[PDB]
Design a binder for this molecule. Structure first.
Ligand SMILES: *[C@@H]1O[C@H](CO)[C@@H](O[C@@H]2O[C@H](CO)[C@@H](O)[C@H](O)[C@H]2NC(C)=O)[C@H](O)[C@H]1NC(C)=O
Ligand SMILES: *[C@@H]1O[C@H](CO)[C@@H](O[C@@H]2O[C@H](CO)[C@@H](O)[C@H](O)[C@H]2NC(C)=O)[C@H](O)[C@H]1NC(C)=O
Ligand SMILES: *[C@@H]1O[C@H](CO)[C@@H](O)[C@H](O)[C@H]1NC(C)=O
Ligand SMILES: *[C@@H]1O[C@H](CO)[C@@H](O)[C@H](O)[C@H]1NC(C)=O
Ligand SMILES: *[C@@H]1O[C@H](CO)[C@@H](O)[C@H](O)[C@H]1NC(C)=O
Ligand SMILES: *[C@@H]1O[C@H](CO)[C@@H](O)[C@H](O)[C@H]1NC(C)=O
Ligand SMILES: *[C@@H]1O[C@H](CO)[C@@H](O)[C@H](O)[C@H]1NC(C)=O
Ligand SMILES: *[C@@H]1O[C@H](CO)[C@@H](O)[C@H](O)[C@H]1NC(C)=O
Ligand SMILES: [Zn+2]
Lengths: 78, 892
């Protein structure tokens, strides 16, 4: 589950790194075997990294980046 | 004869750098005034011993320090004299520090000041702009320094050749962002004396002119993107606008244009960022402040679902203009305002290179012919015009300076640069400009420096010309006006003369060149381009211009040259025959040329008016935008002269006949107005066809526009009118309707969210045919709670453009002149209908009654209006009957 809001409110940047971030993988403390609406041009997806497919964990393991783009032009990693 | 009573600064002192701290107060004081407080230190070098410090200061109150208005300190061991006294000299806008001794040659000194000024709503200096966010009043602190208002925010040597470095600090509410030319130096920090304020210091600026400084405090939001040349681009606007995406197009075009200009001119943009910011209140279109370019919202923001294609073209062209100034104006700066075209003409030309780059399918460079060449030839055919480069000794006061921000400096500058690029080729031109920019970066230039570097480029490329660049271009730069080239195709003879709309006008400005030009003449024969020619003399002969049999020739292919062309009557007839046979055989731009030239020659009594009118006959089957626009613009004079006379009926009947087939064509091609053409020029052609049909009484047009406006009234939140058509639909629906349509449009205006829509409604509201409604609207134009001050005069002009509003507005100006002045375009617009002895006498009596008050930056304009009025009186007398007969015989 992921949710985020675009920066705004005064002096902030609307097409930069999102203001609010919540990446909550349930059952985490390393666990082993979309809320954000279309707020303007902002969208997001999961992208591949070192693993070939598209034990999970948000902490470093001895990865797959979560990308969030604006108008398919400005991309931001979480 | 006292230095403090002369308008130009002495040459005795020259600044090196400044620090300035400014603190705006965005809430009123006990007196209801918005104020800012500041401090400054200027470091300067004494070039010649003097016992006085003369520095600009405007509407600033000084806080005493160590017993005087300023503190004077030594540098590097210097021991400055004690201060005797200071004075504020209001006419020359100076602070004058009288000293008990003389400064030492080649020594440095520092002067410290502490001051306060009004953050007025006057759009000049450091001022306030206001908008609403819901029910919350938002107040913004912003700047406009050009030409001579930097002195209104802090004391400075406020002349463009007094370049210096600037160290800016802004003290602002802790919740609000401070912006300046440079990026912030570190984080904003709370003010120690009061943590409700933050202190934001900015990095030192490059060496630069005072008129380019900017200080903005707001809670705007922005979007940003690093451009491919590494420059950070930010688009700043009211939070709602940024969130709505109205800055996205500017972000799309700004960086790419900047990189394009840097590459094209082989000259990097040297600053780390270029901010673009849109202000709710701004006098001009924009201002090229180095690092912090300001714009009207209507020149920067754009809404793809409600803004027109014309709005988009304005945005991209204004951005290109302001970015062009980063090279032509900021990096290299005029020595003095007399050479203003070196900034604005280049920017006026180079904008087309940038905009065409951003929108290569629009073919905007072509529009330079209508929007610049023919725009400026109107005023540059007057005896009261002025040279591209005015003598420096004539330009001294702020009024004389602001007078030069006119059609000559912008549009003639651009036209002459277009011509130079054409005969040199653009590649050679830009090589020479790159050399110019490299040599004079961070310095100041006059026109001769430009000629020298262009000559270096010509020599490097072995371009052969009839003489040096200097001798060719001085003819176009140091004397006013332009030639008409008259061709006798029987013999192939050419001659030139200074083109004057009134043969009787009294030319009083001498020219060392005798109003003779060196003219690059291009030409086509029966559609095939011929060899280029150089006209060096008052007259010449060449077989290029001789014809026999059926052949015709035309000069000035694509109107690259800044001159008008006349022909013998036989060649004119051949041209008209070609237009009837197959008008596509003549380049569209040369068709516009044929129309505009013929109409102007007719005004000057060089061709019969019937020849110019005959040149419009083919328009009944012309679908291209440009020739129609040239015709409509030329006929605008006929409308101004005749729309209160018996001629207007027949004139409208003629235009109705000529435009009806085009209107029906667009009705079919657009699927009954459901779509708009893909090509920009076709979109503009459609808009002109609708405007012409409705203005001249085509019943299908009146029905269409009233129906569309009623449908909007029935669904106010679902506007069914394509943005391109809104201006004309609104105007004609209001004209065709009554109080209910007017009140609807007014309420849409007051609640408007996009400035383009507001602009269209505000213009449309002046189209009411009811005098009482126009009077009420006039009363609204003066209330800043109803119409923003930045838009007051524009709206009055819209009213004066209405035939029913002419007398209303002229009487208003006569009745309210003192109040208006104490609290230029208006004179020009209000007087252009004048065609009677009575109106001339009214204008002269107005002049007499207000000579003491003066006319400021409208002085020249009044003289031009008088000249035009006298010409208009004579022209109507000579033509009113013949034109009536022509329209009568051709309207059937
Ligand atoms: C504006 O800021 C610059 C940068 O600090 C100042 O330039 C410095 O001046 C001192 C004093 O002469 C020198 O020791 C430094 O080497 C200079 N630094 C640079 C980078 O030039 C400049 O004096 C400031 N101007 C004012 C009016 O305060
Ligand atoms: C004069 O202007 C015309 C029209 O703007 C130019 O013709 C265009 O040339 C471009 C470049 O090849 C073509 O892509 C267009 O299709 C042409 N337009 C038309 C309507 O055919 C012409 O090249 C210009 N010539 C000069 C010397 O300036
Ligand atoms: C959102 O984030 C907060 C902490 O930032 C957390 O307490 C909450 O559980 C998160 N909600 C979801 C649905 O992930
Ligand atoms: C400056 O002084 C004048 C005259 O004393 C006064 O009217 C004006 O309000 C002052 N301005 C400010 C900003 O205090
Ligand atoms: C002002 O300074 C405070 C100090 O921490 C900071 O929290 C705040 O974000 C600053 N305001 C701006 C607009 O940067
Ligand atoms: C501008 O926006 C359009 C979307 O219509 C996009 O295709 C284009 O790539 C953008 N320009 C740049 C330089 O990214
Ligand atoms: C107008 O021309 C006359 C002579 O033709 C000349 O004396 C006069 O000075 C001119 N007008 C002006 C304003 O100089
Ligand atoms: C063109 O104007 C002439 C008079 O200058 C007139 O005799 C002629 O009829 C006009 N052309 C047409 C097609 O009527
Ligand atoms: Zn400009």
């Amino acid at each position: 589950y992921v949710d985020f809001k675009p920066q705004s409110g005064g002096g902030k940047c609307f097409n930069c790194y999102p203001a609010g971030v919540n990446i909550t993988l349930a059952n985490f403390n390393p666990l082993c075997v979309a809320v954000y609406a279309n707020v303007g041009r902002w969208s997001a997806s999961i992208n591949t990294g070192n693993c070939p497919f598209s034990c999970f964990s948000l902490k470093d393991i001895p990865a797959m980046p979560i990308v969030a783009n604006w108008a398919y032009s400005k991309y931001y990693t979480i | 004869s006292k230095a403090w009573n002369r308008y130009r600064l002495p040459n005795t002192l020259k600044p090196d750098s400044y620090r300035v701290t400014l603190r705006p107060y965005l809430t009123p004081n006990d007196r209801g005034l918005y104020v800012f407080k500041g401090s400054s230190t200027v470091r300067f070098t004494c070039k010649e011993a003097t016992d006085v410090i003369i520095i600009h200061s405007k509407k600033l109150n000084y806080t005493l320090s160590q017993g005087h208005r300023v503190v004077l300190r030594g540098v590097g061991g210097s021991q400055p004299p004690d201060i005797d006294k200071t004075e504020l000299v209001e006419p020359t806008e100076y602070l004058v520090v009288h000293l008990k001794g003389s400064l030492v040659k080649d020594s440095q000194y520092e002067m410290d000041s502490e001051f306060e000024g009004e953050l007025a709503d006057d759009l000049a200096g450091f001022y306030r702009s206001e908008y609403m966010e819901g029910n919350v009043r938002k107040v913004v602190a912003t700047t406009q320094m050009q030409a001579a208002d930097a002195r209104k925010s802090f004391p400075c040597f406020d002349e463009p050749a007094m370049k210096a470095e600037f160290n800016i600090t802004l003290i602002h509410p802790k919740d609000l962002t401070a912006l300046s030319n440079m990026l912030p130096k570190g984080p904003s920090t709370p003010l120690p004396e009061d943590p409700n304020w933050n202190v934001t210091e900015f990095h030192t600026t490059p060496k630069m002119s005072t008129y380019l400084l900017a200080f903005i405090v707001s809670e705007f939001d922005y979007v940003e993107k690093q451009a491919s040349n590494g420059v950070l681009i930010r688009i700043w606007a009211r939070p709602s606008a940024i969130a709505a995406g109205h800055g996205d197009y500017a972000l799309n075009v700004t960086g790419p244009i900047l990189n394009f200009f840097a590459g094209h001119y082989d000259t990097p943009y040297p600053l780390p960022k270029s901010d673009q910011i849109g202000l709710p209140d701004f006098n001009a279109g924009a201002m090229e402040n180095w690092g912090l370019v300001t714009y009207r919202e209507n020149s920067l923001l754009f809404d793809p679902l409600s803004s027109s294609s014309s709005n988009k073209e304005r945005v991209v062209t204004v951005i290109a203009h302001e970015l062009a100034h980063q090279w032509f104006g900021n990096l290299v700066t005029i020595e003095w305002w007399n050479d203003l075209w070196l900034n604005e003409g280049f920017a006026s030309y180079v904008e087309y290179l940038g905009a065409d780059y951003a929108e290569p399918t629009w073919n905007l460079k072509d529009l330079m012919v209508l929007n610049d060449v023919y725009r400026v030839m109107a005023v540059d055919a007057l005896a009261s015009s002025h040279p591209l480069s005015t003598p420096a000794s004539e330009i001294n006061t702020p009024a004389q300076i602001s007078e030069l921000f006119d059609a000559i400096s912008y549009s003639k500058g651009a036209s002459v640069l277009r011509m130079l690029s054409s005969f040199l080729s653009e590649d050679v031109f830009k090589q020479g400009l790159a050399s110019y920019l490299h040599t004079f970066a961070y310095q100041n230039t006059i026109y001769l420096n430009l000629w020298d570097h262009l000559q270096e480029a010509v020599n490097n490329r072995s371009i052969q010309l009839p003489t040096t660049v200097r001798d060719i271009m001085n003819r176009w730069t140091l004397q006013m006006g332009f030639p008409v080239i008259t061709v006798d195709t029987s013999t192939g003879t050419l001659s030139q003369e200074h083109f004057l709309l009134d043969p009787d006008s009294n030319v009083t400005r001498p020219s060392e060149f005798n109003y003779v030009w060196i003219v690059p003449i291009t030409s086509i024969r029966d559609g095939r381009q011929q060899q280029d020619y150089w006209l060096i003399d008052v007259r010449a002969q060449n077989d290029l211009f001789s014809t026999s049999g059926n052949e015709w020739v035309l000069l000035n292919l694509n109107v690259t040259g800044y001159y008008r062309v006349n022909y013998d009557e036989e060649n004119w007839r051949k041209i008209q025959t070609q237009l009837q046979r197959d008008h596509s055989a003549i380049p569209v731009i040369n068709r516009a040329q044929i129309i505009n030239d013929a109409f102007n020659l007719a005004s000057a009594h060089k061709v019969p008016v019937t020849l110019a009118l005959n040149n419009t006959l083919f328009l009944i089957e012309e679908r291209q935008y440009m020739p129609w626009e040239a015709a409509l613009s030329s006929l605008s004079y006929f409308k101004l002269m005749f729309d209160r006379s018996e001629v207007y009926g027949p004139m409208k009947n003629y235009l109705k006949k000529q435009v009806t087939p085009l209107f029906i064509h667009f009705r079919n091609n657009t699927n009954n107005w459901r779509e708009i053409p893909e090509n920009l020029m076709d979109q503009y052609s459609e808009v002109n066809a609708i405007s012409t049909a409705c203005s001249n009484g085509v019943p299908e047009c009146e029905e269409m526009v009233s129906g569309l406006f009623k449908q909007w009234m029935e669904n106010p939140n679902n506007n069914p009118i394509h943005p391109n058509l809104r201006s004309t639909v609104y105007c004609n629906a209001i004209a065709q309707g009554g109080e209910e349509e007017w009140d609807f449009a007014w309420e849409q205006f007051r609640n408007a969210t996009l400035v383009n829509e507001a602009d269209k409604l505000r213009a449309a509201l002046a189209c009411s045919k009811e005098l009482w409604i126009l009077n009420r609207y006039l009363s609204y134009t003066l209330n800043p709670d109803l119409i923003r001050k930045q838009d007051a005069t524009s709206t009055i002009i819209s009213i004066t453009n209405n035939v029913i509003g002419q007398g209303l507005v002229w009487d208003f100006v006569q009745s309210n002149w003192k109040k208006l002045f104490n609290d230029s375009n208006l004179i020009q617009a209000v007087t252009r209908r004048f065609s009677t002895e009575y109106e001339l006498q009214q204008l002269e009596q107005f002049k007499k009654d207000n000579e003491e008050t003066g006319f400021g930056s409208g002085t020249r304009a009044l003289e031009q209006a008088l000249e035009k009025t006298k010409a208009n009186i004579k022209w109507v007398k000579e033509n009113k009957e013949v034109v009536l007969q022509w329209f009568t015989e051709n309207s059937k």
